[PDB]
Design a protein around this ligand. Structure first.
Ligand SMILES: *[C@@H]1O[C@H](CO)[C@@H](O[C@@H]2O[C@H](CO)[C@@H](O)[C@H](O)[C@H]2NC(C)=O)[C@H](O)[C@H]1NC(C)=O
Ligand code: NAG
Lengths: 50, 50
């Protein structure tokens, strides 16, 4: 994927790996090397008018 | 079964009339929608991600 990985305060259960959104897309991940939780945010975008 | 309102009988005859001797001033409220909320959809960003 493509996005911004931010430090999160999500409380994952020890058997959980990913945290999903309403649209069943990946919203939070668990780092496999060090046991920390990250949030994924899409990068900045917006409409343009001329 | 539903009720269509209170039953009434107008006391009509061929030489009788009814005339008000007093009145009242009513203030009623009428609510009308005018314009809904404007929306725009980015089709490429909706259908596809990056
Ligand atoms: C017409 O109706 C009005 C009510 O809308 C009457 O006014 C009331 O009269 C009584 C009797 O004096 C008072 O106690 C109330 O305070 C009045 N109400 C208001 C809002 O002023 C009025 O008297 C009636 N007129 C006639 C000729 O019948
Ligand atoms: C007017 O009404 C009365 C009573 O309701 C009745 O007797 C009379 O016939 C009526 N007039 C006519 C022209 O029908």
């Amino acid at each position: 994927g493509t996005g911004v990985l931010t430090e999160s305060n999500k409380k994952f259960l020890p058997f959980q790996q990913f945290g999903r959104d309403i649209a069943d897309t990946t919203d939070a991940v668990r780092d496999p090397q060090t046991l920390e939780i990250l949030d994924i945010t899409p990068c900045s975008f917006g409409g343009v008018s001329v | 079964t539903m009720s269509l309102g209170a039953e009434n009988s107008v006391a009509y005859s061929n030489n009788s009339i009814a005339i008000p001797t007093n009145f009242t001033i009513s203030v009623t409220t009428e609510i009308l929608p005018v314009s809904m909320t404007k929306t725009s959809v980015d089709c490429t960003m909706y259908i596809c991600g990056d």
